[PDB]
Amino acid sequence: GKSKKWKEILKFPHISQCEDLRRTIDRDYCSLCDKQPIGRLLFRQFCETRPGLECYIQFLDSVAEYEVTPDEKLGEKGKEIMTKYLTPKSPVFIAQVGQDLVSQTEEKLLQKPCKELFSACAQSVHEYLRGEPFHEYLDSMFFDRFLQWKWLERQPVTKNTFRQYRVLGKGGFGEVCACQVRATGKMYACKRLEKKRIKKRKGESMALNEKQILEKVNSQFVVNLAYAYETKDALCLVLTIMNGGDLKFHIYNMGNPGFEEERALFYAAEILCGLEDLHRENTVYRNLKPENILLDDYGHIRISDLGLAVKIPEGDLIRGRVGTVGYMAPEVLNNQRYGLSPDYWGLGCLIYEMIEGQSPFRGRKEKVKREEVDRRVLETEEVYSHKFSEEAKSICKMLLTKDAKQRLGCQEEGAAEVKRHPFFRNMNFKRLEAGMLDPPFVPDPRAVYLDHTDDDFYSKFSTGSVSIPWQNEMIETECFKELNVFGPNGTLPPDLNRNHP
Ligand SMILES: Nc1ncnc2c1ncn2[C@@H]1O[C@H](COP(=O)(O)OP(=O)(O)OP(=O)(O)O)[C@@H](O)[C@H]1O
Ligand SMILES: [Mn+2]
């Protein structure tokens, strides 16, 4: 769905145009060879040229496959990796691992197969690439090509960069549309924030807060921010598109009054991962409700509606009675200094409501006032049914602990405490986070489930494209493969040769 002249829009600039990028970018290994997708691919492509570095890339790949290998096939994958990479005579043999650490891997294999077997060897392969191989790549043509990709990334994002279609949406500040990137054709979701409604409502702080939080988090289970630009009539937020309806619709309208045990476990697992990724940024969500868990095209879920979120400084608490009736934790209802605990309360509400088919403190039939719901949350102990297994009951009443100090996941450990819970005894999060596991429900594709002031913050908001989502977009749409073309037989293409502009 790309424009007819898309190859001109994303045309590489001459390497001479990237001299100010070269002098400011930080030469960090993890950022330029891993975190950034296009940067990662280029370093890998650099290691593919030199033959001595080829095996190290093949090795790390086979390690990634082992971490997600089914628990049973771990023993088989362990011997395959050994006989190929960790045997001196073999052709592709990583040497910088050391003769001692390979003998250690042999004992680990003999004492049962653990998913973290080669974790020690992988960290040894990286520590080697961080040195000479990385600095050679920094001088190689591939890094020059990376600079050209950064030059495109940081280009101005305006209205003419997209192709607004029409879809559902009408939030507190505006509406939502289906914007498509013209040069790449990738579908997105545009969240228009009208200009006038923000100034009179003193929303500049909550809109900028929502934008910064949306870009500062990159998780497969939370709506990501790809672009943030301004137009002559509103402020746009380009977010991930979710065409599989929301979770509230599927709990009640779709399926039976609820979900099955196992089905709810899957959605609970990905929500738990989404919260973990937010909590690595010490950012609390506080708005965990069924209709804010959207499904994508393949059946997976993402947490959306991060406007009610806030970033908590490490080692500090925040106060605020905000949220939705029935989904507010007692410490929030009482308006106390809380941290991340309200999100694990809401998680209990989500697990309960998916398995039973109603809120833990508000029946689906009950016409109760907003005060009685708050009373149950603070005083009443929820009851369970034969729909909950013994483990399902546990994780709920542990996540629904009135005292936030003893609530599951609200300890020093964090989300790791919840993944161990016997309720997730059969969930392989190593495989869930890699998309290896299949969702339980697949949405059918065809289914349709002024003034001079304030100009200061308008530029603080309209920051342009986001780095990692933009590089992913180029890879998914296959713009990277088609454009990332060098000269024949390892030769500098015209755009990477300085002798002729
Ligand atoms: N990723 C998406 N793809 C397509 N449509 C979406 C997507 N995300 C949200 N929408 C739709 O656009 C609407 C935008 O409304 P918005 O989420 O901003 O506020 P709200 O739903 O009214 O609740 P709140 O006040 O807590 O934000 C959503 O209600 C939803 O219907
Ligand atoms: Mn919303």
PDB file of C-alpha atoms in Angstrom, residues 363-499:
ATOM      1  CA  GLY A 363     -22.994  -8.483  40.235  1.00  0.00           C
ATOM      2  CA  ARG A 364     -24.013  -8.344  36.600  1.00  0.00           C
ATOM      3  CA  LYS A 365     -27.646  -8.102  37.770  1.00  0.00           C
ATOM      4  CA  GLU A 366     -27.196  -5.828  40.794  1.00  0.00           C
ATOM      5  CA  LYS A 367     -28.323  -2.205  40.493  1.00  0.00           C
ATOM      6  CA  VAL A 368     -26.144  -0.894  43.321  1.00  0.00           C
ATOM      7  CA  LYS A 369     -25.098   2.641  44.190  1.00  0.00           C
ATOM      8  CA  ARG A 370     -21.528   3.874  43.846  1.00  0.00           C
ATOM      9  CA  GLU A 371     -21.201   3.907  47.647  1.00  0.00           C
ATOM     10  CA  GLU A 372     -22.042   0.231  48.197  1.00  0.00           C
ATOM     11  CA  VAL A 373     -19.479  -0.873  45.609  1.00  0.00           C
ATOM     12  CA  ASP A 374     -16.830   1.091  47.505  1.00  0.00           C
ATOM     13  CA  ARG A 375     -18.030  -0.488  50.758  1.00  0.00           C
ATOM     14  CA  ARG A 376     -17.666  -4.025  49.392  1.00  0.00           C
ATOM     15  CA  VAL A 377     -14.187  -3.236  48.058  1.00  0.00           C
ATOM     16  CA  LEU A 378     -13.146  -2.053  51.530  1.00  0.00           C
ATOM     17  CA  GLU A 379     -15.058  -4.471  53.788  1.00  0.00           C
ATOM     18  CA  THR A 380     -16.656  -7.351  51.864  1.00  0.00           C
ATOM     19  CA  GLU A 381     -14.681 -10.487  51.012  1.00  0.00           C
ATOM     20  CA  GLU A 382     -15.369 -11.686  47.477  1.00  0.00           C
ATOM     21  CA  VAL A 383     -16.730 -15.202  46.968  1.00  0.00           C
ATOM     22  CA  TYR A 384     -15.771 -17.646  44.222  1.00  0.00           C
ATOM     23  CA  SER A 385     -17.512 -20.447  42.331  1.00  0.00           C
ATOM     24  CA  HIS A 386     -16.771 -23.814  40.729  1.00  0.00           C
ATOM     25  CA  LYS A 387     -15.499 -21.880  37.700  1.00  0.00           C
ATOM     26  CA  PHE A 388     -12.284 -21.167  39.636  1.00  0.00           C
ATOM     27  CA  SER A 389      -9.717 -23.892  40.143  1.00  0.00           C
ATOM     28  CA  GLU A 390      -7.964 -24.039  43.500  1.00  0.00           C
ATOM     29  CA  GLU A 391      -5.050 -22.117  41.973  1.00  0.00           C
ATOM     30  CA  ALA A 392      -7.337 -19.569  40.305  1.00  0.00           C
ATOM     31  CA  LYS A 393      -8.990 -18.805  43.647  1.00  0.00           C
ATOM     32  CA  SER A 394      -5.578 -18.302  45.261  1.00  0.00           C
ATOM     33  CA  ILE A 395      -4.131 -15.800  42.787  1.00  0.00           C
ATOM     34  CA  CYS A 396      -7.340 -13.748  42.932  1.00  0.00           C
ATOM     35  CA  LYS A 397      -7.731 -13.449  46.706  1.00  0.00           C
ATOM     36  CA  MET A 398      -3.985 -12.774  46.864  1.00  0.00           C
ATOM     37  CA  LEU A 399      -4.175 -10.035  44.227  1.00  0.00           C
ATOM     38  CA  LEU A 400      -7.379  -8.763  45.890  1.00  0.00           C
ATOM     39  CA  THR A 401      -5.758  -8.438  49.327  1.00  0.00           C
ATOM     40  CA  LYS A 402      -7.232  -5.377  51.036  1.00  0.00           C
ATOM     41  CA  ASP A 403      -3.874  -4.561  52.655  1.00  0.00           C
ATOM     42  CA  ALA A 404      -1.609  -3.449  49.810  1.00  0.00           C
ATOM     43  CA  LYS A 405       1.438  -4.423  51.886  1.00  0.00           C
ATOM     44  CA  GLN A 406       0.585  -8.143  51.620  1.00  0.00           C
ATOM     45  CA  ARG A 407      -0.884  -8.061  48.100  1.00  0.00           C
ATOM     46  CA  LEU A 408       0.698 -10.345  45.520  1.00  0.00           C
ATOM     47  CA  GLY A 409       3.390  -8.684  43.428  1.00  0.00           C
ATOM     48  CA  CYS A 410       3.467  -5.656  45.762  1.00  0.00           C
ATOM     49  CA  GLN A 411       6.752  -6.826  47.323  1.00  0.00           C
ATOM     50  CA  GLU A 412      10.386  -6.079  46.538  1.00  0.00           C
ATOM     51  CA  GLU A 413      10.403  -8.836  43.911  1.00  0.00           C
ATOM     52  CA  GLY A 414       7.622  -7.410  41.748  1.00  0.00           C
ATOM     53  CA  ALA A 415       5.954  -9.143  38.811  1.00  0.00           C
ATOM     54  CA  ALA A 416       8.235 -12.180  39.131  1.00  0.00           C
ATOM     55  CA  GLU A 417       6.332 -13.162  42.284  1.00  0.00           C
ATOM     56  CA  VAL A 418       3.106 -13.420  40.276  1.00  0.00           C
ATOM     57  CA  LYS A 419       4.491 -15.436  37.352  1.00  0.00           C
ATOM     58  CA  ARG A 420       5.549 -18.135  39.822  1.00  0.00           C
ATOM     59  CA  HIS A 421       2.033 -18.362  41.255  1.00  0.00           C
ATOM     60  CA  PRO A 422       0.635 -21.918  40.843  1.00  0.00           C
ATOM     61  CA  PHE A 423      -2.099 -20.402  38.678  1.00  0.00           C
ATOM     62  CA  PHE A 424       0.573 -19.877  35.989  1.00  0.00           C
ATOM     63  CA  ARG A 425       2.137 -23.294  36.626  1.00  0.00           C
ATOM     64  CA  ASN A 426       1.570 -24.278  32.976  1.00  0.00           C
ATOM     65  CA  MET A 427       2.284 -20.885  31.350  1.00  0.00           C
ATOM     66  CA  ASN A 428       5.734 -20.547  29.755  1.00  0.00           C
ATOM     67  CA  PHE A 429       6.299 -16.795  29.897  1.00  0.00           C
ATOM     68  CA  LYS A 430       9.593 -17.262  28.040  1.00  0.00           C
ATOM     69  CA  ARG A 431       7.470 -18.506  25.125  1.00  0.00           C
ATOM     70  CA  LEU A 432       4.522 -16.158  25.704  1.00  0.00           C
ATOM     71  CA  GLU A 433       6.750 -13.081  25.482  1.00  0.00           C
ATOM     72  CA  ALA A 434       8.105 -14.405  22.162  1.00  0.00           C
ATOM     73  CA  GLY A 435       4.630 -14.830  20.662  1.00  0.00           C
ATOM     74  CA  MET A 436       5.250 -18.576  20.417  1.00  0.00           C
ATOM     75  CA  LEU A 437       1.959 -19.423  22.142  1.00  0.00           C
ATOM     76  CA  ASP A 438      -1.260 -19.102  20.144  1.00  0.00           C
ATOM     77  CA  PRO A 439      -4.128 -16.915  21.429  1.00  0.00           C
ATOM     78  CA  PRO A 440      -7.398 -18.673  22.318  1.00  0.00           C
ATOM     79  CA  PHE A 441      -9.594 -16.449  20.133  1.00  0.00           C
ATOM     80  CA  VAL A 442      -8.636 -15.134  16.686  1.00  0.00           C
ATOM     81  CA  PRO A 443     -10.712 -12.123  15.531  1.00  0.00           C
ATOM     82  CA  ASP A 444     -11.979 -12.689  12.011  1.00  0.00           C
ATOM     83  CA  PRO A 445     -10.375 -10.029   9.757  1.00  0.00           C
ATOM     84  CA  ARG A 446     -13.670  -8.951   8.174  1.00  0.00           C
ATOM     85  CA  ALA A 447     -15.261  -8.551  11.621  1.00  0.00           C
ATOM     86  CA  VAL A 448     -15.939  -5.068  12.985  1.00  0.00           C
ATOM     87  CA  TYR A 449     -16.023  -5.603  16.752  1.00  0.00           C
ATOM     88  CA  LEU A 450      -5.869  30.604  20.158  1.00  0.00           C
ATOM     89  CA  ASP A 451      -2.982  32.556  21.689  1.00  0.00           C
ATOM     90  CA  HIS A 452       0.776  33.008  21.491  1.00  0.00           C
ATOM     91  CA  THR A 453       1.288  31.103  24.745  1.00  0.00           C
ATOM     92  CA  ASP A 454       1.111  27.286  24.758  1.00  0.00           C
ATOM     93  CA  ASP A 455       3.339  27.267  21.673  1.00  0.00           C
ATOM     94  CA  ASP A 456       6.072  26.229  24.122  1.00  0.00           C
ATOM     95  CA  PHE A 457       4.430  22.932  25.087  1.00  0.00           C
ATOM     96  CA  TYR A 458       3.164  22.302  21.546  1.00  0.00           C
ATOM     97  CA  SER A 459       6.790  21.758  20.515  1.00  0.00           C
ATOM     98  CA  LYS A 460       7.533  19.731  23.655  1.00  0.00           C
ATOM     99  CA  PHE A 461       4.725  17.421  22.487  1.00  0.00           C
ATOM    100  CA  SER A 462       5.252  17.328  18.708  1.00  0.00           C
ATOM    101  CA  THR A 463       8.547  15.452  19.101  1.00  0.00           C
ATOM    102  CA  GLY A 464       8.141  13.546  15.825  1.00  0.00           C
ATOM    103  CA  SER A 465       8.676   9.844  15.201  1.00  0.00           C
ATOM    104  CA  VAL A 466       9.692   7.376  17.913  1.00  0.00           C
ATOM    105  CA  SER A 467      12.949   5.561  17.257  1.00  0.00           C
ATOM    106  CA  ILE A 468      12.226   1.873  17.867  1.00  0.00           C
ATOM    107  CA  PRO A 469       8.653   1.786  16.471  1.00  0.00           C
ATOM    108  CA  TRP A 470       9.803   3.652  13.360  1.00  0.00           C
ATOM    109  CA  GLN A 471      12.636   1.197  12.689  1.00  0.00           C
ATOM    110  CA  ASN A 472      10.219  -1.693  13.228  1.00  0.00           C
ATOM    111  CA  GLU A 473       7.755  -0.141  10.774  1.00  0.00           C
ATOM    112  CA  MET A 474      10.484   0.012   8.124  1.00  0.00           C
ATOM    113  CA  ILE A 475      11.288  -3.673   8.669  1.00  0.00           C
ATOM    114  CA  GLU A 476       7.722  -5.004   8.815  1.00  0.00           C
ATOM    115  CA  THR A 477       6.620  -3.158   5.665  1.00  0.00           C
ATOM    116  CA  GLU A 478       9.765  -4.478   3.899  1.00  0.00           C
ATOM    117  CA  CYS A 479      11.002  -0.947   3.184  1.00  0.00           C
ATOM    118  CA  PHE A 480      14.304  -1.850   4.858  1.00  0.00           C
ATOM    119  CA  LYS A 481      14.978  -4.911   2.701  1.00  0.00           C
ATOM    120  CA  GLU A 482      14.180  -3.141  -0.571  1.00  0.00           C
ATOM    121  CA  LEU A 483      16.073   0.059   0.257  1.00  0.00           C
ATOM    122  CA  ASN A 484      18.963  -1.388   2.287  1.00  0.00           C
ATOM    123  CA  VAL A 485      20.900  -2.323  -0.868  1.00  0.00           C
ATOM    124  CA  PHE A 486      24.674  -1.953  -1.122  1.00  0.00           C
ATOM    125  CA  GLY A 487      26.999  -2.122  -4.115  1.00  0.00           C
ATOM    126  CA  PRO A 488      27.586  -5.383  -5.978  1.00  0.00           C
ATOM    127  CA  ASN A 489      30.038  -7.775  -4.310  1.00  0.00           C
ATOM    128  CA  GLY A 490      30.700  -5.675  -1.220  1.00  0.00           C
ATOM    129  CA  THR A 491      31.099  -2.278  -2.880  1.00  0.00           C
ATOM    130  CA  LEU A 492      30.189   1.178  -1.634  1.00  0.00           C
ATOM    131  CA  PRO A 493      26.919   2.301  -3.271  1.00  0.00           C
ATOM    132  CA  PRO A 494      26.776   5.890  -4.551  1.00  0.00           C
ATOM    133  CA  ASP A 495      25.064   7.173  -1.404  1.00  0.00           C
ATOM    134  CA  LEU A 496      27.833   5.710   0.798  1.00  0.00           C
ATOM    135  CA  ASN A 497      30.788   6.895  -1.327  1.00  0.00           C
ATOM    136  CA  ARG A 498      32.129  10.353  -0.503  1.00  0.00           C
ATOM    137  CA  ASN A 499      34.232  10.796  -3.653  1.00  0.00           C
TER     138      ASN A 499
END
